[PDB]
């Protein structure tokens, strides 16, 4: 019933920032909330950003916090990431998705992420 789409996802060249944007629509208003992730080949799924749903903060990993951007449309229900200073290790499928009760089982369609340096 849940999906999560992204826009302006894809190339960019090493310090070039990016701005990601996923929007979300079905029925959540419990303890949901929206983060970006990504993932590798070969290797598992990790997250990056995500934020909650009440009024306490957002959640950065210790892989590009400092450098990567978060906030929200604070109008609907949509989600903004400005990857800046980026690297070649940031280069991969960058998937939005969702919690429920301090999970995360919501994915989204995915934006693969070219850099380089």
């Known amino acids: 019933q849940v999906q999560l789409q992204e826009s302006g996802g894809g190339l960019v060249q090493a310090g070039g920032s990016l701005r990601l944007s996923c929007a979300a629509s079905?029925?959540?208003?419990?303890?949901?909330?929206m983060g970006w992730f990504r993932q590798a080949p070969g290797k598992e799924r990790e997250s990056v950003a995500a934020?909650?749903?009440?009024?306490?903060?957002?959640y950065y990993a210790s892989s590009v916090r400092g450098r990567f951007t978060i906030s929200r449309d604070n109008a609907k229900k949509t989600v903004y990431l400005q990857m800046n200073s980026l690297k070649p290790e940031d280069t991969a499928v960058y998937t939005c998705?969702?919690?429920?009760?301090?999970?995360?089982?919501?994915w989204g369609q995915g934006t693969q992420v070219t850099v380089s340096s």
């Open positions: 934020i909650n749903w009440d009024s306490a903060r957002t």
């Open positions: 079905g029925r959540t208003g419990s303890t949901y909330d």
């Open positions: 998705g969702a919690g429920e009760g301090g999970t995360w089982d919501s």
